[PDB]
Amino acid sequence: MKFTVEREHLLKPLQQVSGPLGGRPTLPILGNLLLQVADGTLSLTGTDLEMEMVARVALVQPHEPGATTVPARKFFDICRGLPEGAEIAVQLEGERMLVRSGRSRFSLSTLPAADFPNLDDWQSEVEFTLPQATMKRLIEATQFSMAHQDVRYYLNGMLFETEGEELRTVATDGHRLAVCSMPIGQSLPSHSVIVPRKGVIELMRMLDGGDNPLRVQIGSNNIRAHVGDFIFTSKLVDGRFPDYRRVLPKNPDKHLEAGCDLLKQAFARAAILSNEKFRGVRLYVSENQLKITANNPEQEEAEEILDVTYSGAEMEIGFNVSYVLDVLNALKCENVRMMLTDSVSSVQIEDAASQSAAYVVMPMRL
Amino acid sequence: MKFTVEREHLLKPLQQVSGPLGGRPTLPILGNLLLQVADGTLSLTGTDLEMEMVARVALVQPHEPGATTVPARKFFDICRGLPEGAEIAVQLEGERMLVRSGRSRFSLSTLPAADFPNLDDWQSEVEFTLPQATMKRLIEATQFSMAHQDVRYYLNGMLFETEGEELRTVATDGHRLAVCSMPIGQSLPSHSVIVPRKGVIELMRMLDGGDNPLRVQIGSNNIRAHVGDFIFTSKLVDGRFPDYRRVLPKNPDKHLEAGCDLLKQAFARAAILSNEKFRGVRLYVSENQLKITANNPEQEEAEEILDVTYSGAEMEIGFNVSYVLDVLNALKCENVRMMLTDSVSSVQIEDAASQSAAYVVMPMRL
Amino acid sequence: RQLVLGL
């Protein structure tokens, strides 16, 4: 195996395929990247046994076929550390892989390509293409609502669903839920899968924010995404995930509309004097007015009064202010609509100008 | 106590005095800021018992004299969280301090101004002024060589010495030493004091390179610096600081000059294959050439060859990577000069174009 | 005092 490639043609791919690797690999091979030269292409692959990221790099300089695995962090750091424009010559020499550039030389230890973990073959059952920007929107709109190491391991991931002509994501941790739907232009078979936490992170990382379209393939137990010369594949999480349609408040009769930023800034200031652990704030809704109050164990108190559009009966309701701020931060809009029922029921929050995303937050008893 | 002032006039002062804080504030009182209104001025003071920072704000709006103390971080966050252009009205009302702006209200807990610790009166014995940029240069040139949590407390700080017409800083952790001196155009008495590491950080913090000079006053047990309308005071550290004059190599006859950036990147790249738990590289010096090599337990190896200017006898000597990189990062000049003696003696490093700073690094056995 | 959703 032999290849010579310009530093920058190699750097981003190395960075990307290293994504799924941890700071401390359980076993040596998991800290390595698989390098394969075949048919004028160098392929780089990184894995954590649950998912893998592959990059294809075109070789325009002389090369020889073959494969090996070498330490990912070390190889990336070497390439990144070389001068801009450096030519990086690489050759497999049995127990070691020799990297040369200028008068810089590096000998890395190798592990057999035959020993590199490989995800089982699988078949795609649904396929579609969508703009990278749509995938980014879908994930960013709901990722914060995923559980963090919950017993219901399925809540630690994100649900991806195809319906009619839309792709939708759903995340929930039992206290709040986020759902976002986006049209795809294609007619798809109704489908529902759970993508693991690290999988969601990798999907986001592979979006360059360019014109390259995103091609998705979903099987019974895997999801694959292709962008440019990168291919990400992850196993899916098994389990039964909640039906957002049922979690949404049944009859949120009371509707309030308010500027997103004024509401966010008021909650942010009130949060300063809320209980450091429980973070509770009180909302008192009255005709065209919202009063937010917060108090803590030190007898400190914050009060914010805001003009809003509201005509229902008066009511008071408590919330974890961090859950509310998380939603307002995810909604990048001018105005928001809060739909309430009563003090003991969940509230649904959405962009006042779009039903694309919806957030359900359960209240707390102050 | 009562005052009303623009948020815009409080921001910088608050940041300056609230700085030393956050991490587990010992005495509750130390997490508060002392606020005092007297003769048309609002003074704000923060302290950790070892040092104190005082800021002044002029009051043109109606005000009433008095003093109290309030949670520093909370008061700063409330002020910063209010909208640009906000006016902030503050009044002490018994056990609470009421803060009002627009339709936002905050009631903060207080502690008696009489309880606020203040450094005992002291007397200055040495005074001088110098440019903010000169002080910044003196500190940045040596700060990285101070010890961290060393049982020898006097090394967990920085020596400030006046001699002739220069101000000099010295820092060392017993393995490497940094010294820098700068002329300040004033005839000074010979004096030497040790400023604690936290005080050094704070000093650095109040410097903005303005043409506005820093006024320094040094006493037997304290140091004070006045910048604009901020006054910083810190206790000094007891102990006999080592004499850098006895640390500089006696006759470092072998002089090598190398491009700073090229040497830095060669060290940085070679370090990737050095021992992860204790990173060091071997230098082989020969006529106009430097070879830098690293090895690790995995038998991996790195080699860098650099053209340099050197005409002495050949020698091989090892160094701790971080110590040399720290020096090259602090010099950030075009070329550096390494002055060597032999394989078992420390090296002195300087900017090839300036003798203002000098660094001494012991060799590392590999 | 946090209540939970009916998932």
Examine the domain organization and report whether B166 and B268 are in the same domain: no
Q: Show the tokens assigned to B290.
A: 């430097």
Q: Which of A97, A123, A149 is the last residue of a domain?
A: A123
The dihedral sign for the CA sequence B58, B61, B66, B72: negative
Cβ-defined contact of B301 to A266 (cutoff 8 Å):
no
Cβ-defined contact of B303 to A78 (cutoff 8 Å):
no
How far apart, in whole angstroms, are the C-alpha atoms of residue B186 and residue B188?
Answer: 6
How far apart, in whole angstroms, are the C-alpha atoms of residue A317 and residue A282?
Answer: 6
Q: Are A14 and A8 in contact (CB under 8 A)?
A: no
Cβ-defined contact of C7 to A318 (cutoff 8 Å):
no
How far apart, in whole angstroms, are the C-alpha atoms of residue B69 and residue B25?
Answer: 15
Chain B residues with beta carbon closer than 8 angstroms to that of A269: 78, 81-82, 104, 106
Examine the domain organization and report whether B2 and B119 are in the same domain: yes
How far apart, in whole angstroms, are the C-alpha atoms of residue A8 and residue A209?
Answer: 19
Angle between helices A260-271 and B72-81 (to 10 degrees): 170
Q: Are B18 and B73 in contact (CB under 8 A)?
A: yes
**Burial (CB count within 10 angstroms: exposed 0-12, middle 13-18, buried 19+), residue A100:** middle
Examine the domain organization and report whether A280 and A366 are in the same domain: yes
Examine the domain organization and report whether B111 and B135 are in the same domain: no
How far apart, in whole angstroms, are the C-alpha atoms of residue B134 and residue B136?
Answer: 5
Q: Show the tokens assigned to B347.
A: 């090296």
Q: In what order do the strands lie in the sheet with B301-307?
A: A2-6, A87-93, A96-101, A104-109, B301-307, B289-295, B280-286, B315-320
Examine the domain organization and report whether A13 and A80 are in the same domain: yes
Q: Are B93 and B140 in contact (CB under 8 A)?
A: no
Cβ-defined contact of C1 to A364 (cutoff 8 Å):
yes
How far apart, in whole angstroms, are the C-alpha atoms of residue B325 and residue B344?
Answer: 20
**Burial (CB count within 10 angstroms: exposed 0-12, middle 13-18, buried 19+), residue A245:** exposed
Q: Are B184 and B167 in contact (CB under 8 A)?
A: yes
Q: Show the tokens assigned to A221.
A: 């137990």
Chain A residues with beta carbon closer than 8 angstroms to that of B298: 109
How many other C-beta atoms are found inside a 10 Å radius of the C-beta of residue B90? 25
Cβ-defined contact of A303 to B74 (cutoff 8 Å):
no
Breaks after residues in chain A, judged by C–N over 2.5 Å: none
How far apart, in whole angstroms, are the C-alpha atoms of residue B57 and residue B44?
Answer: 8
Q: Show the tokens assigned to B256.
A: 């090598």
Q: Are B247 and B360 in contact (CB under 8 A)?
A: yes
Examine the domain organization and report whether A41 and A116 are in the same domain: yes
Residue A357 to residues A168, A188, A244, A333, B212: CA-CA distances in angstroms?
9, 20, 11, 12, 53
Of C1, C3, C6, the CB nearest to A247: C6
Mutate to test the interface with B, among A73, A272, A299 (most CBs of B within 10 A): A272
Q: Which residues pair with B41 in a beta bridge?
A: B38, B58
Q: Are B78 and B106 in contact (CB under 8 A)?
A: yes
For residue A275, give the chain C residue with the closest CA.
Answer: C1
Pairing of strands A315-320, A32-38: unpaired
How far apart, in whole angstroms, are the C-alpha atoms of residue A233 and residue B60?
Answer: 65
Q: Which residue, among A282, A360, A280, has the nearest Cα to A320 in the 3D structure? A: A280
Examine the domain organization and report whether B109 and B216 are in the same domain: no
* DSSP letter assigned to residue A298: T
How far apart, in whole angstroms, are the C-alpha atoms of residue B291 and residue B304?
Answer: 6
How far apart, in whole angstroms, are the C-alpha atoms of residue A49 and residue A345?
Answer: 42
Q: Which residue, among A252, A283, A261, has the nearest Cα to A349 in the 3D structure? A: A252
Examine the domain organization and report whether A234 and A156 are in the same domain: yes
Instruction: Report DSSP letters for B297-348, one per residue.
Output: TT--EEEEEEE-B--S--EEEEEEHHHHHHHHHHH-SSEEEEEE--TTS-EE
Tokens 């920085």 belong to residue: B158
Pairing of strands A254-259, A347-351: unpaired
Task: Name the 3-class secondary structure at B18.
Answer: helix
Structure-determination approach: X-ray
How far apart, in whole angstroms, are the C-alpha atoms of residue A358 and residue B303?
Answer: 57
The dihedral sign for the CA sequence B191, B194, B200, B202: negative
How far apart, in whole angstroms, are the C-alpha atoms of residue A190 and residue A169?
Answer: 13
How far apart, in whole angstroms, are the C-alpha atoms of residue A299 and residue A309?
Answer: 31
For residue C6, give the chain A residue with the closest CA.
Answer: A247
Q: Are A203 and A139 in contact (CB under 8 A)?
A: yes
Task: Name the 3-class secondary structure at C5.
Answer: coil
Q: Is A106 on the interface with B (CB under 8 A)?
A: yes
How many other C-beta atoms are found inside a 10 Å radius of the C-beta of residue B243? 11
How far apart, in whole angstroms, are the C-alpha atoms of residue A354 and residue A330?
Answer: 13
Q: Residue A120: CB partners within 8 Å, gap ≥ 6?
A: none
How far apart, in whole angstroms, are the C-alpha atoms of residue A135 and residue A235?
Answer: 19
The dihedral sign for the CA sequence A327, A332, A338, A339: negative
Q: Are B172 and B134 in contact (CB under 8 A)?
A: no
Total tally of structural domains belonging to chain B: 3
Chain A residues with beta carbon closer than 8 angstroms to that of B277: none
How far apart, in whole angstroms, are the C-alpha atoms of residue A117 and residue A235?
Answer: 13
Examine the domain organization and report whether A23 and A82 are in the same domain: yes
Q: What is the CATH number of the domain that holds B191?
A: 3.10.150.10
Instruction: Report DSSP letters for B72-132, one per residue.
Output: HHHHHHHHHHSPTT-EEEEEEETTEEEEEETTEEEEEE-B-GGGS--PPP--EEEEEEEEH
How far is A173 from chain C, CA to nearest CA, in Å? 9
The dihedral sign for the CA sequence B86, B91, B97, B103: negative
How far apart, in whole angstroms, are the C-alpha atoms of residue B218 and residue B178?
Answer: 22
Q: Show the tokens assigned to A187.
A: 């007619």
Examine the domain organization and report whether A174 and A288 are in the same domain: no
Q: Is A18 on the interface with C (CB under 8 A)?
A: no
How far is A85 from chain C, CA to nearest CA, in Å? 54
Cβ-defined contact of A107 to B302 (cutoff 8 Å):
yes
Cβ-defined contact of C3 to A246 (cutoff 8 Å):
no
Q: Which residue, among B52, B358, B83, B36, has the nearest Cα to B230 in the 3D structure? A: B52
Q: Is B165 on the interface with A (CB under 8 A)?
A: no
Of A81, A299, A303, the CB nearest to B268: A81
Q: Residue B120: CB partners within 8 Å, gap ≥ 6?
A: none
Q: Which residues pair with A92 in a beta bridge?
A: A97
* DSSP letter assigned to residue A151: S
Resolution of the model in angstroms: 1.6
CA dihedral A59, A18, A232, A199 (to 10 degrees): -170
How far apart, in whole angstroms, are the C-alpha atoms of residue A32 and residue A34?
Answer: 7
Pairing of strands B213-219, A222-227: unpaired
How far apart, in whole angstroms, are the C-alpha atoms of residue B139 and residue B158?
Answer: 9
Examine the domain organization and report whether A210 and A298 are in the same domain: no
Cβ-defined contact of B104 to A269 (cutoff 8 Å):
yes
Tokens 């791919």 belong to residue: A13
Q: Are A337 and A363 in contact (CB under 8 A)?
A: no
Q: Which of A123, A156, A190 is the last residue of a domain?
A: A123
Residue B95 to residues A300, B70, B106: CA-CA distances in angstroms?
10, 10, 13
Q: Which of A123, A151, A167 is the last residue of a domain?
A: A123
User: A146-171 burial, b if ≥16 CB within 10 A, otherwise e?
Assistant: bbeeeeeebbbbbbbbbeeebbbbbb
DSSP H helix total and E strand total for chain B: 6, 22
Range of the domain at A220: 124-247
Q: In what order do the strands lie in the sheet with A176-195?
A: A158-172, A176-195, A354-361, A347-351, A335-340, A254-259
Examine the domain organization and report whether B94 and B171 are in the same domain: no
How far is C5 from chain A, CA to nearest CA, in Å? 6
Residue A44 to residues A17, A116, B57: CA-CA distances in angstroms?
7, 12, 60
